Design a protein around this ligand. Structure first.
Ligand SMILES: *[C@@H]1O[C@H](CO)[C@@H](O[C@@H]2O[C@H](CO)[C@@H](O)[C@H](O)[C@H]2NC(C)=O)[C@H](O)[C@H]1NC(C)=O
Ligand SMILES: *[C@@H]1O[C@H](CO)[C@@H](O[C@@H]2O[C@H](CO)[C@@H](O)[C@H](O)[C@H]2NC(C)=O)[C@H](O)[C@H]1NC(C)=O
Ligand SMILES: OC[C@H]1O[C@@H](O[C@H]2[C@H](O)[C@@H](O)[C@H](O)O[C@@H]2CO)[C@H](O)[C@@H](O)[C@H]1O
Ligand SMILES: OC[C@H]1O[C@@H](O[C@H]2[C@H](O)[C@@H](O)[C@H](O)O[C@@H]2CO)[C@H](O)[C@@H](O)[C@H]1O
Lengths: 258, 262
């Protein structure tokens, strides 16, 4: 059995959201590997399929429920279950395809999307850029219902993809950055619905690069600057790890410590 | 894939008051002093340092060497092979401290004046001992959001938490390489803490002393730690009304968590 964290957009509040993400991060890392004060995620190679996924269950006001399956090695949303069916993003390699076999074994119907979960593919199908898709508790309620009804056939493909972009950002990207968590937390505090800033979009894109730079830095010093953006769009370069310590919450494992 | 391969980056070393670690008058004779000096926008090798794999910091080929293992000796440039071996060894910590493993004396700058000779003092996590390897010569300016979504704000010699007006009386702060947090509009003022006592009220005094009560660090857990005392910024009794930010031991509630919004 895989661990199951649950969150509901029903009485969603800034606290219930902060505990949810705190719970999701708590289940991804084992706390054994930490570098420069930032927890690293399990190494894929040699990880027993019984500790390879965690399950996040979301439910909204309409009583509809959906269960997302996140890969513990990268906090990647790999699929989901809705009722008696399960849908998986198209695996991009043999190993992964073999692993999603152990997810939602109950379900009578397992479908595998023709496309992957990556943002490009998802933004293309959605007919919108991450910059135009609004985020908040309102958008999460809608995304759950949209995701739920796809099993009964009442959700067009463009909307499914717009719902995956919403969940991925509010759960997986929020667990990866305290900056993005706080961003989502502000949208809940004031009941706002608004697309992610250039700062959020950029941090999402640089997760892989940052994971690498920090882990193979020479005493917190990067070899090459990683460029990021501000809320207003202006860019700035980061040369050291210290400025990122209060911004990144999880790192994808890149290489072993000396 | 493999074991991590740490590289050898060429970077500037910004420290006290935003000044750079400079090799005096561009000369490299064994013994010439190392000093604080306004950062340059160019390639003068006397201000760029290569962080070697062996733990030596080199500028233009020579090693950043300490004169002796006594609190007070100065730091000089020197031939790496001639110099006493473990007097060229340094570790750069995540909390901006650059220490000489062998004497436990930290690289310091006991004066914020341009031209001040670097020395090695006893570690007390003061602003005069905080450094940062970066080609970034400018301090980072952000908004610090904390309890109840309110912003950290300063009004003359005082600092409290209040609602975020994306324009208000400077709620923008500048984070320096030396670990001091300075109010955007008045950059020679430091977020200061008088005593290291379990409840002293944090205020805004001049960065002049560059004390160990003016140097802070943003932890991964969202707190703002005062390196020297071990106490974290705390909004007094989760009450923004009281208008008082104190130093308090860590317990992790919402009144001790902050997020830098840039
Ligand atoms: C800070 O700037 C210096 C110079 O502007 C960079 O040093 C250069 O690095 C490249 C590749 O790393 C070398 O080929 C050059 O020889 C270096 N310039 C010099 C001094 O001749 C340095 O890389 C920058 N810091 C970082 C890590 O971005
Ligand atoms: C500044 O960071 C350094 C990290 O190297 C801290 O010193 C080390 O702390 C670890 C535990 O976190 C110990 O295992 C080491 O023995 C310490 N010394 C060395 C040379 O590694 C230091 O405590 C930090 N400063 C503060 C007060 O937070
Ligand atoms: O020490 C101050 C400052 O010196 C610059 O070098 C000067 C030097 O002061 C002067 O005597 C010489 O004739 O010309 C040099 C080039 O301007 C350094 O470049 C600077 O980094 C500081 O080190
Ligand atoms: O003394 C500062 C300390 O206050 C705590 O809050 C207390 C407060 O003293 C009072 O309102 C009552 O005793 O209960 C409150 C809840 O603990 C804070 O918890 C602590 O962080 C400090 O700010």
């Amino acid at each position: 059995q895989y661990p199951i964290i649950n969150f509901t957009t029903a009485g969603a509040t800034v606290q219930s959201y902060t505990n949810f993400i705190r719970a999701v991060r708590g289940r991804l890392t084992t706390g054994a590997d930490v570098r420069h004060e930032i927890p690293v995620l399990p190494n894929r190679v040699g990880l027993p399929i019984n500790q390879r996924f965690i399950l996040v269950e979301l439910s909204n006001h309409a009583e509809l429920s959906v269960t997302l399956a996140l890969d513990v090695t990268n906090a990647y949303v790999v699929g989901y279950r809705a009722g008696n069916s399960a849908y998986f993003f198209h695996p991009d390699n043999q190993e992964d395809a073999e692993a999603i076999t152990h997810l939602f074994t109950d379900v009578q119907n397992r479908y595998t999307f023709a496309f992957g979960g990556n943002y490009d593919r998802l933004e293309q199908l959605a007919g919108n850029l991450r910059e135009n898709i609004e985020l908040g508790n309102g958008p999460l309620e809608e995304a759950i219902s949209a995701l739920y009804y796809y099993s009964t056939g009442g959700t067009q493909l463009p909307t499914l993809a717009r719902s995956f972009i919403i969940c991925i950002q509010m759960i997986s990207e929020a667990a990866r950055f305290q900056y993005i968590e706080g961003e989502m937390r502000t949208r809940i505090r004031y009941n706002r619905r608004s697309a992610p800033d250039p700062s959020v979009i950029t941090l999402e894109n640089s997760w892989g690069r940052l994971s690498t730079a920090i882990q193979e830095s020479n005493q917190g010093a990067f070899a090459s600057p990683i460029q990021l953006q501000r809320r207003n769009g202006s860019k700035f370069s980061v040369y050291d790890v210290s400025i990122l310590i209060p911004i990144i919450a999880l790192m994808v494992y890149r290489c072993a410590p000396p | 894939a493999d074991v991590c391969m740490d590289p050898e980056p060429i970077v500037r070393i910004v420290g006290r008051n935003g000044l750079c670690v400079d090799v005096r008058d561009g000369r490299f004779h064994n013994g010439n002093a190392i000093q604080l000096w306004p950062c340059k926008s160019n390639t003068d090798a006397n201000q760029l340092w290569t962080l070697k794999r062996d733990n030596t910091i080199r500028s233009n080929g020579k090693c950043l060497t300490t004169y002796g293992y006594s609190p007070g000796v100065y730091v000089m440039i020197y031939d790496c092979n001639t110099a006493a071996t473990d007097a060229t060894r340094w570790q750069i910590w995540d909390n901006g401290t650059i220490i000489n493993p062998r004497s436990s004396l930290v690289l310091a700058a006991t004066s914020g004046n341009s031209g001040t000779t670097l020395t090695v003092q006893t570690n007390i996590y003061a602003v005069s001992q905080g450094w940062l390897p970066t080609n970034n010569t400018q301090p980072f300016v952000t908004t610090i959001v904390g309890l109840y979504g309110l912003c950290l704000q300063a009004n003359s010699g005082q600092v409290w938490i209040e609602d975020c007006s994306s324009e208000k009386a400077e709620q923008q702060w500048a984070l320096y390489a030396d670990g001091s947090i300075r109010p955007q509009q008045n950059r020679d003022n430091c977020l200061t803490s008088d005593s290291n006592i379990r409840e002293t009220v944090v205020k805004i005094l001049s960065c002049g002393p560059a004390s160990s009560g003016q140097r802070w660090m943003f932890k991964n857990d969202g707190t703002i730690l005062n390196l020297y005392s071990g106490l974290v910024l705390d909004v007094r009794a989760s009450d923004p009304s009281l208008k008082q930010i104190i130093l308090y031991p860590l317990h992790g509630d919402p009144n001790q968590i902050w997020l830098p919004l840039f």
